[PDB]
Amino acid sequence: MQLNNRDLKSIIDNEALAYAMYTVENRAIPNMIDGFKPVQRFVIARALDLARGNKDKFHKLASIAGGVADLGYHHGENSAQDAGALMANTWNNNFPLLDGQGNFGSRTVQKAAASRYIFARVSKNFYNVYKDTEYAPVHQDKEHIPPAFYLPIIPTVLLNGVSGIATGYATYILPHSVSSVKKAVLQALQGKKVTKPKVEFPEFRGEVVEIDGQYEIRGTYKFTSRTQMHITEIPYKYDRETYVSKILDPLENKGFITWDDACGEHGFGFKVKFRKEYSLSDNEEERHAKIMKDFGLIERRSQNITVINEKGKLQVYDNVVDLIKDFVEVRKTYVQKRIDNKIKETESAFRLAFAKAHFIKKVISGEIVVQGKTRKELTEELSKIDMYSSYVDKLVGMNIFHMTSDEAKKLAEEAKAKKEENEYWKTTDVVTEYTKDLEEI
Amino acid sequence: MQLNNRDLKSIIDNEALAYAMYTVENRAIPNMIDGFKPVQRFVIARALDLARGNKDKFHKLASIAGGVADLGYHHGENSAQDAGALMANTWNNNFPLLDGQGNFGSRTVQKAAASRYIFARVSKNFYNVYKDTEYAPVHQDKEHIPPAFYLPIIPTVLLNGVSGIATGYATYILPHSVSSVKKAVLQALQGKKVTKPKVEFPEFRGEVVEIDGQYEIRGTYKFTSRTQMHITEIPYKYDRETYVSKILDPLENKGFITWDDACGEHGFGFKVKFRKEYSLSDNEEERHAKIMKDFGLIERRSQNITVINEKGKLQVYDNVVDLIKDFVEVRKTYVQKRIDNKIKETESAFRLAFAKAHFIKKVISGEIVVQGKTRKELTEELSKIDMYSSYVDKLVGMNIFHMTSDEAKKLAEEAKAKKEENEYWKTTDVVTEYTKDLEEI
Amino acid sequence: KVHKHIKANLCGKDADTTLFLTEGDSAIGYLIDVRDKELHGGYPLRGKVLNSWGMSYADMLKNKELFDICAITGLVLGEKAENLNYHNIAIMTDADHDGLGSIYPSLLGFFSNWPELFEQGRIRFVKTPVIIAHVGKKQEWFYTVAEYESAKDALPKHSIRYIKGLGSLEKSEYREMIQNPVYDVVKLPENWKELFEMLMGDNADLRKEWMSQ
Amino acid sequence: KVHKHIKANLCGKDADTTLFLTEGDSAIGYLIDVRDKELHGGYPLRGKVLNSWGMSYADMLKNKELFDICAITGLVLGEKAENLNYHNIAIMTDADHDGLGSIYPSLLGFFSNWPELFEQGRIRFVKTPVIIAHVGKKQEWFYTVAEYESAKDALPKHSIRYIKGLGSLEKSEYREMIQNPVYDVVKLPENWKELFEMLMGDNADLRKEWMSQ
DNA sequence: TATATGTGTATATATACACACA
DNA sequence: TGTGTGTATATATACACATATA
Ligand SMILES: [Mg+2]
């Protein structure tokens, strides 16, 4: 039994500080490049591993959440389940990175079904945008199986909208239109005046107006008659139950309105009949203001663009254009890394293919017979040759049919094809490759 | 809108009957052969799948339960988590088929920790007694990846204790000593008279007594004075909370006893000091009977041996010896099946190895010269030869290093070894293999 | 008001409004979007319904689900069914074994204290596919596992989807099964009390003779 | 009276009795087996502890976990600690970031209502391994993640087990950490009020300034 | 002052079924 | 006439954290 005095200052300055910085840098603030919180990175890495074999197979969300603990996840699997269910829907994300199968929620019920019901898979958006996974940075933690961050070609953090709370810091980024973000990325890459991306909410038919930095999310109403009114859209933050209980119910028990549901396939819709107690002004402007304020049809939102940059530290951006410029500047370096690595890999592959072709051409018509000898002495004799050096375990590991006519020519043609690929990779630049990647979208 | 009338009699005779029979044959009653409920079989199959490449790696219960739905599990993963936790306790199983890491419970607290903490792997007992997995029956459902049942060499349904409630039928089998079960299996296999296996509870230091088909589980007490006694063991049905709240505390709040916790390495140790108003009779027999009755130190159990046989039906046995004899009779057939399949497979392997070994000698300065001809030339000329009629694809697919003397004699040695092994497999019988595999436990 | 009840616009008034009784919260998320707003309402029933055969009315009402069912409709446990908020009660549970052979007949037993809804055809069951087979370029729906197993042999190469619950269906299939319904109108036979006592009763020997034939 | 509270045989008598404040119920397992029966008692908390800084006594007592720390012990919020059921209070929590970074300092802030407890050394923290490294034939125990990272480079080839909570520990390791405990006795500094206000006060700018250095 | 958003820490609760044992 | 066992059905809660908006 050991008894050591420990002042509260040491506890607060070590353990509490570690927890606070962990909540900031590893729980709730998304990465600037890929837009993933670490739990979402784990979920998508596990989904990629699951979809390695068949890319169109739907895997149960319980199956995806179970295996994240082996990738380096250190928390409960229900958190991973809930994070995954929030990534595989088309009502909360403009650019979903998982397809879902089952009930993943809607704009009326913003609650996915239990994970025992619903399946998920990596989306075609992920394969279309997230490139150069093999060149992603390696996490400093040996037990962190997924990379430090993925390498998309456009900032995904701006696409689906992020809301996270940490100890001492919080982030709130509104969703943006994919086309505007892609256009802004192209403008930044070409070295132009970057146009600010437009804010777009999925499944939203209302209006979004930028006033004094604030964003006004406005629903829509129309008047069928003097006392009847149809609400065709409500601000994005509302549910059916939330809007009914907060606005529509504390207006009928007050004797003001009588409302009926019309939430058809279009989305949110209500039919409100006004009683004589509720009176509207003569002019249209004040009446419009009173109606649009009483029914909660205006939502005001501010942007707190706080992200974890490529160096792992916190960063606050005044607007979105600066974030896009920083993302493009970081991503061009990884495009250059891809180019260099592919140059080296194509050179190595061409060297191996040419060595194998020369070995075959010497075996069929040459002094090398591979008969009446041993394996170790054959390996030494091959190691004598400089061209065959460093390829002795791959030259004798070739099948018999490689000595046939139909397969001796294929090796030389493959060597020529790899040489032409290496030549192609030795002439491109970062800008052209990035432009092609953007053109893929 | 398809308004079709439906009588209640048809509903009961179709869907209610299907559910009841499904509860009996697929949820609650264990299989006679492998001693698994279907959920336990799915858990075992998933753990075996996870064990490929590393038999000693520990996998989270969430990881094991996540992938069982891909194997054909049609229920929520929570039941799989609970079953997996129950299967790796050791304190509840005489023969644990899952090795556990973490808090899986104890006799005092018969509740495992949450699945977000505990790990499991396949125990060495499973690898010891479960043989011939490749010859296990194939389930009639293509989506049922695990077999119809596994093939242990001793009845595991008799080892760990089974309790299950279905609609109309229920099963309760007490745990039995592994050594006694193995001895009874050997006696039944050898045709001698079979002795009844002894009922043994895990980590129980009390006494088990058989009387007219009913088992008495007795705890022990020792008097350290004329008024103070020490309860050293209590029946297996109790945990600390239940014994305290049902026996010790009702007596304490009556002026009878005052009790202290004297537990330790062996659980359920109490120190009871009697009060003045609790009259301990001078008769030793009466004192013993009163202490047994008042402190709940005697548990009375009876077995209800209900199982699912190899045909999938429900069978009720009145004895354990009958179950052992039926299990041995069924398992002898699968031993014979293993022998036959091994004979066939090893004959085919020897034929293939001999064909390859002779082809290689016929390439080294032989009539077959690979060089200077096309792919179809070899794949048709060799197909003409009777000896390479069905092996030409694997013949030409062999590596170049299979053409030196060192690797050419190894092919002949492999062929000779396969011939000798096939000859060995052609002489054994069911009894010899069964005795060999039983004695390896 | 009932917390999780989703009212129809014509509920309580004179119409043919139908109450949908799902077996969970997850099975009703898509219902409010694909239903007829004027004529359809829903209420999620938590878990396995109370076995209320031979129970007293006071014991019956101690269950949250049964009390909420009686509250949403106008059903009084000791009185006739005369003025109800919903014209039809459409039980629509998951199509697996538990939902179809445990919750559904127990719900029928609970509704049997008004053996006039059945006579008037106001108790319905909404058929739901338990198996969805992607045969070539078309999706085939099998409502019971027995039907799929019987018809599994005479189909070409395909892949099946097992519908564990109504939360496993997509919005297209949920909408198809809601706005194009297949209704089983439950009708009580003359000896419905015997069939309900056998399946729901104290004597477990009555379920053994029934299950052995 | 207090449910889930396992009592020591000398609770209420003059002895060096210790109360183990355990985070969660999965962590209280194996304690009843490896504890000193005459001197060790335990109580499982439930997750994060309510932030009690600047709160009223009537508001702290509305928390069940905080209410059943003043009932198990003789602690009264408005009174000194002079008649205590347990001599020492041993907070033992999961050594991950969440436990020892939020639950432990929150519990310290709650117990700061009686600084005489800290002055007497009756508030202790039981150090528990967060990482167990199988190095060769031996095991290395690391109580904090930073401790593991500081020696990970110099460590030889090994495999580490991350201990999420006390429910991830073997009975041997639990027994080793309980019967051979490494306590840290908490001592309140001269300005503990300012530190507690910074960590748990309503102004987040102080937290930002603290985290930015 | 009062909500609410999402990633985390911990739990909990009704029901059905059989049957022997109190 | 309770009741405990174990696969299944479904669901629920209390806590922390920040910052804008009502
Ligand atoms: Mg814990």
The set of residues, in sequence order, having a beta carbon less than 8 Å from that of D187 and lying 6+ positions away, is A5, A6, A7, A8, D118, D121
Region of residue A24 (phi > 0: left; psi between -120 and 50: alpha; otherwise: beta) = alpha
The set of residues, in sequence order, having a beta carbon less than 8 Å from that of A250 and lying 6+ positions away, is none
CA angle B425, B427, B429 (to 5 degrees): 90
State CA A278 to chain mean position distance: 48
Q: Are strands D138-142 and D40-44 parallel, antiparallel or unpaired?
A: unpaired
Residue B409 and residue B402 in contact, taking contact as beta carbons nearer than 8 Å: no
Largest CA distance in chain D: 55
Residue A219 and residue A247 in contact, taking contact as beta carbons nearer than 8 Å: no
Give B113 Cα–ligand 1 centroid separation in angstroms.
9
Q: For tokens 């199956």, name the residue.
A: A63
Q: Give dist(CA A120, CA A58) in Å, integer.
A: 5
B277 three-state secondary structure: coil
- Smallest CA-to-CA distance from B304 within B322, B325, B323, B319 is with B319
> Looking at the domain that runs over A207-301, which CATH code has it been given?
3.30.1360.40
Residue B72 and residue B146 in contact, taking contact as beta carbons nearer than 8 Å: yes
Q: C131-135: long-range contacts at Cβ-Cβ below 8 A with a sequence spacing of 24 or more? A: C131/C160, C131/C161, C131/C162, C131/C163, C132/C160, C132/C161, C132/C163, C132/C173, C133/C158, C133/C159, C133/C160, C133/C161, C134/C158, C134/C159, C134/C160, C134/C161
- Smallest CA-to-CA distance from A97 within A89, A108, A107, A105 is with A89
- Between CA D5 and C1' E9 the distance (Å) reads 20
Cα A39 to Cα A46, B251, D180: the distances in Å are: 11, 53, 36
- Smallest CA-to-CA distance from B74 within C163, D206, D178, D143 is with C163
Q: DSSP letters of A227-257? A: SEEEEEE--TT--HHHHIIIIIGGGTTTTSE
Residue B225 and residue B233 in contact, taking contact as beta carbons nearer than 8 Å: no
Q: Give dist(CA A172, CA B274) in Å, integer.
A: 68
Q: Are strands A170-173 and A162-165 parallel, antiparallel or unpaired?
A: antiparallel
Is residue B396 within a helix (H) or strand (E), and if so which, with residue range? helix B392-396
Residue B358 and residue B387 in contact, taking contact as beta carbons nearer than 8 Å: yes
Residue A61 and residue A81 in contact, taking contact as beta carbons nearer than 8 Å: yes
- Between CA A235 and C1' F11 the distance (Å) reads 30
User: Is D5 within 7 A of strand E by CB distance?
Assistant: no
Q: How many CA atoms lie within 13 A of A272 on its CB side?
A: 25
Structure token digits, residue C191: 């000896």
Q: How many CB pairs under 8 A join B and C?
A: 91
Q: For tokens 């194939």, name the residue.
A: B138
Q: Give dist(CA A21, CA A314) in Å, integer.
A: 10
Burial per residue of A233-272, b for 16 or more beta-carbon CB atoms within 10 angstroms, e otherwise? bbbbebbbbebbeebbeebeeeeebebebbbeeebbbbbb
Handedness of CA D2, D8, D14, D20 (dihedral sign): negative
Q: DSSP letters of A118-161? A: -EEEE-HHHHHHB--GGGSPPPSSTT--S-SS--BSS-THHHH-
Any C CB within 8 A of A240 CB: yes
- Smallest CA-to-CA distance from A98 within A70, A121, A67 is with A121
Residue A308 and residue A25 in contact, taking contact as beta carbons nearer than 8 Å: yes
Neighbours of B207 (CB within 10 A): 12
Q: For tokens 């059943």, name the residue.
A: D68
Structure token digits, residue B381: 């000329």
Q: Give dist(CA B86, CA A386) in Å, integer.
A: 63
Residue B122 phi, psi dihedral angles, 5° rounding: -75, 130
State CA B387 to chain mean position distance: 45
- Smallest CA-to-CA distance from B93 within B19, B40, B134 is with B40
Domain chopping of chain A, boundaries: 8-174+306-318, 207-301, 345-440
Residue C103 and residue C93 in contact, taking contact as beta carbons nearer than 8 Å: yes
> Of all protein residues, which has its CA closest to the C1' atom of E10?
D47
Residue C14 assigned to a binding site: no
Q: DSSP letters of D29-94? A: TTHHHHS-TTTEEEEE--SSPP--TT--HHHHTTSHHHHHHHTTS---TTS---S-S-SEEEEE--
- Which experimental technique did the depositors report for determining this structure? cryo-EM
Q: Give dist(CA A30, CA A307) in Å, integer.
A: 6
Neighbours of B239 (CB within 10 A): 19
B211 three-state secondary structure: strand
Q: For tokens 């006592």, name the residue.
A: C197
> Looking at the domain that runs over A8-174+306-318, which CATH code has it been given?
3.90.199.10
Q: Which of C104, C192, C211 minimises the CB distance to B15?
A: C104
Residue B154 and residue B20 in contact, taking contact as beta carbons nearer than 8 Å: no
Measured between beta carbons, which residues in chain D are less than 8 angstroms from residue A3? 121, 124, 183, 185
Q: Give dist(CA D69, CA D43) in Å, integer.
A: 8
Best of B90, B99, B101, B103 to disrupt the D interface (most D CBs within 10 Å) is: B103
Cα C88 to Cα C14, C22, C42: the distances in Å are: 12, 14, 11
Q: Give dist(CA B239, CA B253) in Å, integer.
A: 20
List, edge to edge, every strand of the sheet that includes C40-44: B3-7, C183-187, C123-126, C88-91, C18-22, C40-44
Residue A81 and residue A63 in contact, taking contact as beta carbons nearer than 8 Å: no
Residues in chain D: 213
Q: DSSP letters of B143-186? A: T--S-SS--BSS-GGGTS-EEEE-SS-EEEE--B-HHHHHHHHH
C6 three-state secondary structure: strand
Subunits with 3+ Cβ pairs within 8 Å of B are: A, C, D
Structure token digits, residue B312: 């999938």
Residue type, B368: I
Q: A251-255: long-range contacts at Cβ-Cβ below 8 A with a sequence spacing of 24 or more? A: A251/A294, A251/A295
- Smallest CA-to-CA distance from A382 within A368, A366, A372 is with A368
Q: Give dist(CA D12, CA D41) in Å, integer.
A: 12
State CA B34 to chain mean position distance: 6
Neighbours of A223 (CB within 10 A): 15
Residues in chain C: 213
Bridge partners (DSSP) listed for residue A208: A217
B407 three-state secondary structure: helix
Residues in chain A: 441
Give B116 Cα–ligand 1 centroid separation in angstroms.
10
User: Is C199 within 7 A of strand E by CB distance?
Assistant: yes
User: Is B167 within 7 A of strand E by CB distance?
Assistant: yes
Subunits with 3+ Cβ pairs within 8 Å of A are: B, C, D
Residue B200 and residue B58 in contact, taking contact as beta carbons nearer than 8 Å: no
Contact criterion met (CB < 8 Å) for A24 and D195:
no
Structure token digits, residue A418: 């790899």
> Looking at the domain that runs over B214-301, which CATH code has it been given?
3.30.1360.40
Task: Report the Cα–Cα distance between both ends of chain B, in Å, rounded.
Answer: 65
DSSP conformational letter for A368: -
Q: Give dist(CA A320, CA A194) in Å, integer.
A: 10
Burial per residue of A308-347, b for 16 or more beta-carbon CB atoms within 10 angstroms, e otherwise? bbbeeebbebeebbebbbbbbebbbebbebbbeebbeebb
Bridge partners (DSSP) listed for residue A199: A176
Residue D32 and residue B108 in contact, taking contact as beta carbons nearer than 8 Å: yes
Residue B40 and residue B157 in contact, taking contact as beta carbons nearer than 8 Å: no
C195 three-state secondary structure: helix
Bridge partners (DSSP) listed for residue D22: D44, D92
Bridge partners (DSSP) listed for residue B229: B223, B272
Q: Give dist(CA D93, CA D78) in Å, integer.
A: 27
Q: Give dist(CA B208, CA D213) in Å, integer.
A: 68
Structure token digits, residue B375: 């792919």
> Looking at the domain that runs over A345-440, which CATH code has it been given?
1.10.268
> Looking at the domain that runs over B17-153, which CATH code has it been given?
3.90.199.10
User: What's this structure's resolution in Å?
Assistant: 2.8
Torsion of CA B72, B78, B84, B88, to 10 degrees: 180
Structure token digits, residue B217: 């589980």
Q: For tokens 């190095």, name the residue.
A: D135
The set of residues, in sequence order, having a beta carbon less than 8 Å from that of A251 and lying 6+ positions away, is A257, A259, A294, A295
- Between CA B230 and C1' F4 the distance (Å) reads 27
Give D23 Cα–ligand 1 centroid separation in angstroms.
5
Q: Give dist(CA B300, CA B347) in Å, integer.
A: 57
- Smallest CA-to-CA distance from B245 within B233, B232, B255, B259 is with B259
Q: Give dist(CA A101, CA A122) in Å, integer.
A: 12
- Between CA B104 and C1' F17 the distance (Å) reads 33
Q: Give dist(CA D88, CA D39) in Å, integer.
A: 10
Q: Give dist(CA B83, CA B97) in Å, integer.
A: 12
Residue D92 and residue D21 in contact, taking contact as beta carbons nearer than 8 Å: yes
Q: Give dist(CA D173, CA D181) in Å, integer.
A: 11
State CA D6 to chain mean position distance: 17
- Smallest CA-to-CA distance from B274 within B285, B295, B259 is with B259
Q: DSSP letters of C25-49? A: STTSTTHHHHS-TTTEEEEEPPSSP
Residue type, A41: R
Bridge partners (DSSP) listed for residue A1: none
The set of residues, in sequence order, having a beta carbon less than 8 Å from that of A63 and lying 6+ positions away, is A50, B66, B67, B69, B70
Q: B193-200: long-range contacts at Cβ-Cβ below 8 A with a sequence spacing of 24 or more? A: B194/B321, B194/B324, B194/B325, B195/B321, B196/B319, B196/B320, B196/B321, B197/B158, B197/B320, B197/B321, B197/B324, B199/B174, B199/B175, B200/B94, B200/B175, B200/B176
Chains C and D touch each other (3 or more Cβ pairs < 8 A): no
Any A CB within 8 A of B373 CB: yes
Torsion of CA B319, B323, B324, B327, to 10 degrees: 180
- Smallest CA-to-CA distance from D181 within D90, D80, D56 is with D90
DSSP conformational letter for D137: T
**Is CATH 1.10.268.10 the classification given to domain B341-428?**
yes
DSSP conformational letter for B333: H
**Strand (E) positions, A45-135?**
59-60, 98-101, 119-122
Contact criterion met (CB < 8 Å) for B1 and C181:
yes
Q: A97-102: long-range contacts at Cβ-Cβ below 8 A with a sequence spacing of 24 or more? A: A97/A44, A97/A122, A97/A123, A97/A125, A97/A126, A97/A130, A97/A156, A98/A44, A98/A47, A98/A122, A98/A123, A98/A126, A99/A58, A99/A123, A99/A124, A101/A58, A101/C168, A101/C170, A102/C167, A102/C168, A102/C169, A102/C170
Structure token digits, residue A350: 């061409």
Q: B38-41: long-range contacts at Cβ-Cβ below 8 A with a sequence spacing of 24 or more? A: B39/B68, B39/B73, B39/B75, B39/B79, B39/B80, B39/B83, B40/B83, B40/B87, B41/B146, B41/B149, B41/B150
- Smallest CA-to-CA distance from A30 within A304, A430, A255 is with A304
Q: Are strands C40-44 and C18-22 parallel, antiparallel or unpaired?
A: parallel
Catalytic sites of A, residue numbers: 117
Q: Give dist(CA A46, CA A148) in Å, integer.
A: 15
Residue B95 and residue B179 in contact, taking contact as beta carbons nearer than 8 Å: no
The set of residues, in sequence order, having a beta carbon less than 8 Å from that of A319 and lying 6+ positions away, is A196, A303, A305
**Strand (E) positions, A255-335?**
257-261, 270-274, 298-301, 305-308, 314-317
Residue B2 and residue B125 in contact, taking contact as beta carbons nearer than 8 Å: no
Q: Give dist(CA D80, CA D109) in Å, integer.
A: 16
